[model samples]
Target: LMGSHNGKVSLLYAGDKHDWNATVGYKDNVATLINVHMKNGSGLVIAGGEKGINNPSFYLYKEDQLTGSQRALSQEEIRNKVDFMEFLAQNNTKLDNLSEKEKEKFQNEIEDFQKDSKAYLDALGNDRIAFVSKKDTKHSALITEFNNGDLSYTLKDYEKNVTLQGSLKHDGVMFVDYSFNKVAVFNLPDLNNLAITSFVRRNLENKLTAKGLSLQEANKLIKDFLSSNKELAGKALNFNKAVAEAKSTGNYDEVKKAQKDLEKSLRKREHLEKEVEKKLESKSGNKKAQANSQKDEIFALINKEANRDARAIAYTQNLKGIKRELSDKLEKISKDLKDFSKSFDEFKNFSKAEETLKALKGSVKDLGINPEWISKVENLNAALNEFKNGDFSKVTQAKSDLENSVKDVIINQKVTDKVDNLNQAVSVAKAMGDFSRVEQVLADLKNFSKEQLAQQAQK
Candidate 1:
């Protein structure tokens, strides 16, 4: 049938009642619609695609009516046009020039819409029809009488299809068409026909959406999105990995940064899925089984999504738990440093606290320490060593320096003040050579030892 915009179909089913019937529409515009060539060795052409950018069309290769000397868009010619369209669509022509390559990608988008419209004008193998936009005003590319190799319809046969289809529309469903037709037409509407068309369009769409993402497709989407958004890929994507270089050396910031990468990977995946679905939302015909089988591309991806999703969650939770454990360990180390024990060789008042830090060091070896924590611990540790190495004299510059280092950790001055005063009294007494004052202070504490010593002497 030369399918018209207004249902003026030229029914050429090779029926028994008639060889051809020109089945036009009700109150329709005389503009020719698109051509439908369900391919042929069994078929042939006309000025097809009339509304195909011009109205409806059928090619008259048999030649009587319009113009021109010869009227054959040879299969080679048609294929050439198809390939050129694809070159632009597939971005093959300008692969060397990056900017032009992108335009070709966009140009491919242009070709696809036209193809669907042109699909209204042509179809597969033999005698498969295609539909298309009405006609070209400005170098509009289209498929006209594409893919066919026979011509049985004469002019007389053509006129007849127009008349018959007119009656068919009048009798069939004009009222219903008027009552309900909105965006899509119902020139050939029926329970099965209508149901199946809608069903396949939506079902195939849903099935492909549920299953169609090839890994390559998702990768390209993410690649495009990330390359554009510097932080999403550049910063957040590898944040944790960058941290592994840190040995992932934190408190909240450490955990917080590590947490960032999981989301970025997930965030980028979110973008890819949505993009795949966007690309997915967009086509159908028959090969019902053939069509169904083709969706294996989607099927592979559906399986892919299933595996990736589980892995994403599992990995996310594992990293989160690990980082949290590290956070708590750092908190304990911070506590160990702050609660100092004047613990060194000469003075080990709080060596137990130091021992806890030693244990912390053992626990922390797996994760490299932060520089600041090392510096704090080193300062504290260095102070005690100096005090042992001649920095302990009351009047020495080293003792005051050592005092400052000890006080860095905020020791209680009230308790240390008495110790300092007693220390001072010793320095003063010794400075004066007051041996008797030393004896009075030393005698009582030494009484038991002294009594033993006296008895031994008398003996």
Candidate 2:
């Protein structure tokens, strides 16, 4: 079976009786449509997309998954794929005859798209068939199932958690086509030849035309609306005031009864006009308010810790063109404290540098670093101070005395000439019992001249 635009379709010779039929309104410029034969000798028609920027879609006879054999994209993933395709098409000829080394220049640019394409394709491996339409902005999935010939069409609007369900005559399956100005399901095949009634065609055409206004018409309409609303607002206020005044006058007679009636009429009119005013305000008001709320939500994540994550970094970097302040501030804070803490760690005088770091923290608190770091500095400073003033007098004295004793110790000098002189000095000091020469000779002792010292001692 084959499906084509303008209601052109054909079913191959398979049935005993001739059931070949064409249906109108189904032929909306199908790009790639195919018909799959059902187990019950019925047919399922699927179109990947329309001619223009329409939704690529498919139809299942019953509960079959219409996953693309090529690819299915996530809500955010679709645009990137389209962009990749566009980029590849543009540079196709430029890379056609390039050598491996020459292609290496374009590897960085080409690899990302290739990887994304593969992922999208792999995701659809479990599905029946899937195809990405042009400018895939909204992502949705539809699964059709037939339980004993009862059709259930479940559409998953992944971006928005909205599910739409509708039944068909025999076996039902549906998907949005590319020409989605409005959504409507009409004349699904009911095992009979469906006719494109004249009334239905004109109605569809009329709806298509009314879907959007021309620029000139929109401009004139807005201008006239604002001007009329401004005039109406004054009248509403006046009528409301008049109603209050009539009640305050307190004339209950029939002669003044008409005045009360007039006031009541005016009040009702004023109330209705106020309702219109509210609707008008609401249309534009929600948009601005929502924008600001969304802005706050996104900007809240721009911080020292959050911005450092790879995903957050990508997000802010992409948003730099629109929200430079948030990204720049996050980057500045991250770099400043990162560099500052690294520099602080390099301080050689851990004990003495406590005071310096404390002062630096005081000056730089609001500059970038969080209050947590300041608290950290305080704790560190206290530890350093405690170590400096702690009761370790014995350890300090031992270290100092050890340093002084090792200072005069001479080593690794040839003492051949000095050994004899040192030995005579030691003997003279020993004879007199002064022993000062002995101390000096021992201080200048060398391992290499130890034998010479022993020989001179015998003399």
Best-matching candidate per TM-score: 1
Model 1, C-alpha of 145: deviation from truth (Å) = 60
Cα miss at 40, model 1 (Å)? 71
TM-score of 2: 0.16
Tell me the spans in candidate 2 whose CA falls farther than 4 Å from its real position.
Answer: 1-219, 223-364, 367-371, 391-459
- Candidate 2's displacement at residue 5, Å, is 92
Assess every candidate by TM-score: 0.22, 0.16
Tens digit of lDDT per residue, candidate 1, span 1-459? Answer: 223232245342322222222332222345233232323212222232323223222222222235744433433333333433333222212222335644554353344434453432232212323222222223222222222321110011110110000111111111101112211111222232212435433443455444544555544543343343333323332332332233213112332344444344445544644454445544333223444444436444333433333344445554556555555555554454344322332243233545754754554453465565455455556664665665434323332343334334223332343344456556778999765655554554366347546744853
Instruction: Give the per-residue lDDT digits (tens) of candidate 2, residues 55-151.
Output: 2331221112365343322222332332333223222212343458535544533554343444323322212222222211244323333222122
- lDDT, model 2, position 49: 27
